[model samples]
Target: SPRKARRARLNPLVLLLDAALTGELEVVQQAVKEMNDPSQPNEEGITALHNAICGANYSIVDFLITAGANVNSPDSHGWTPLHCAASCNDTVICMALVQHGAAIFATTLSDGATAFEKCDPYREGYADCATYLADVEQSMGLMNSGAVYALWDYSAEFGDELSFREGESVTVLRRDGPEETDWWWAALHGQEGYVPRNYFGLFPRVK
Candidate 1:
């Protein structure tokens, strides 16, 4: 004859974090229901959003974001969920976090590295994540005015065209139109010429 045992009680926040890491959407939903604040951090100041990104669980991440999790909540080391996503090279999650208003310029306390700087160059999604973050930063007026990075080498097709090597920094003197155009007037070392706007981007590739 075996005796029945009572269920053990656990902290809802812990359960939520665990569920997020394991991609248990149902468990997370249950845990969130029991918790007063879905964005509450654990002892380490890591929120469910951070764990979800670390675990690469986009479903849980989307659920938590919709459930009111703070996308910009910083962990003990001042690394937000966006930083975690960048570190993991998860561009999908990074886009989601940024779409929900994660602070693109938020830096970590340890080294003052933003989520863009936290991206691993060797990772698959590094370029995409960095480009997206830099674009968002530029849109938010955080970028250096009139500055752009060459995404690819462009050769001068005519006397009025500017030639620039990949990874070179160029200053945008004027755009073709207010609604965006393929050609843009730029200057490099005081020399000005039209360059293909597609050849330039806001984020410089990591060496």
Candidate 2:
């Protein structure tokens, strides 16, 4: 552990690097003034700005960039600052970097994937951070829809037991009710062999 201990006891530059990851404004400022160090790089070729963007810390991102951090700097993985911000879904940091001239198309991995491509389509996957905010734009009366019922059965059949988040009262055809009611309701009235029902949904209809 002496190696790590000695490393920890290194110059203020190293301290600045650690502090920058943690967004320690005081330590970073001191290092900049005393050691003429930005505390921005490691042997891994990652900088303080890279760490800030990785952690999705907006303040640190703003500070490092304002302090003249290189937004285009890439590490061994070839991931640039934009890649980090996009991976964490830090919208503000990503927007800030772009406004500061960081490439919106930058890639992090050796595969040449771009920052825009890094967005999670499912909300928060690290590499695929697309802007999909919800599962689907389903109708409010989804219970009666065949697609919805099928999706429910599939999930319940394979996944855990499910319950309706909400429900509506379905109307069973009664023998005696309003005379001018639905024609189908009248046909099924007091029918002994067949049963008539209305699916309680946005489009309630008797069958």
Candidate 3:
């Protein structure tokens, strides 16, 4: 008898997501294509693009965009592809997403900070992320890059100080001139002592 008919199988989008997570680009591409539509994100609101970005796989990033993935969609964590790339310090992924129109200003993962918050400072190993944040805004066409023309070193705010034993331990901050440092005694008629990163002038103002 004509008992029952087989049910239409559900799309394995979740499996596709798992594939993306595993860097199985071909399967992901096939599954994504099977949907006969664009991506709508998975259970956690993490779209294929987010997965691609986080995976740090440039090819996946390219494939998703070519397949029409939304680059600016926010995930459950309020994070965009840029957020994923930046948080992961995947500059390659970051640049790839930006080229596809990802919202550069989207802030997430607390503190309302943007992906720029995770850029390289080019200082040895990016020791000055905070300092570069201001400049990246405008340069990146997201936040305005406004800063002091002649930026002053914030370290000075701590002010100079001395730590020593007693009378034998002499500490001089500034004297008649920086050359004549109060930190320590130096020579006389000719030269003084060791110089710091900054040069000492006859008067105050850096030499």
Clash tally, candidates in order: 0, 9, 2
Candidate 1 regions with alpha-carbon error over 4 angstroms: 1-6, 142-207
Clashes of 2: 9
Error of 1 at 207 (Å): 40
Instruction: Assess candidate 3 and give its TM-score to the true structure.
Output: 0.54
Candidate 2 lDDT over residue span 1-207, tens digit each: 111222555775566567677767665555555654343567777777887666556777676667767666778888877677766766667657655545333345677776666665455563323442111112212323321111111112322222222222222333233542221121112221111211112221111
lDDT of 3 by residue, 58-126 (tens): 787788877767666677777777676676666566656555555445666556667677554443324
Sort every candidate by TM-score, greatest first: 1, 3, 2
Query: Can you give the TM-score per candidate against the true fold?
Result: 0.64, 0.51, 0.54
After superposition on all CA atoms, what RMSD does each candidate show versus the true structure? 13.8, 21.6, 19.5
Q: For model 1, how does the per-residue alpha-carbon lDDT over 52-106 read when each residue is reduced to its tens digit? A: 8988988889888888787778888999888999887788888787666565566
Off by over 4 Å in 2: 1-8, 35-39, 120-207
| Model 1 alpha-carbon miss at residue 190, Å | 36
- Spell out the clash pairs found in candidate 2: 79-108, 118-129, 119-128, 119-129, 119-130, 120-128, 120-129, 120-130, 121-130
Judged by whole-model lDDT over C-alpha atoms, candidate 2 comes out at: 0.48
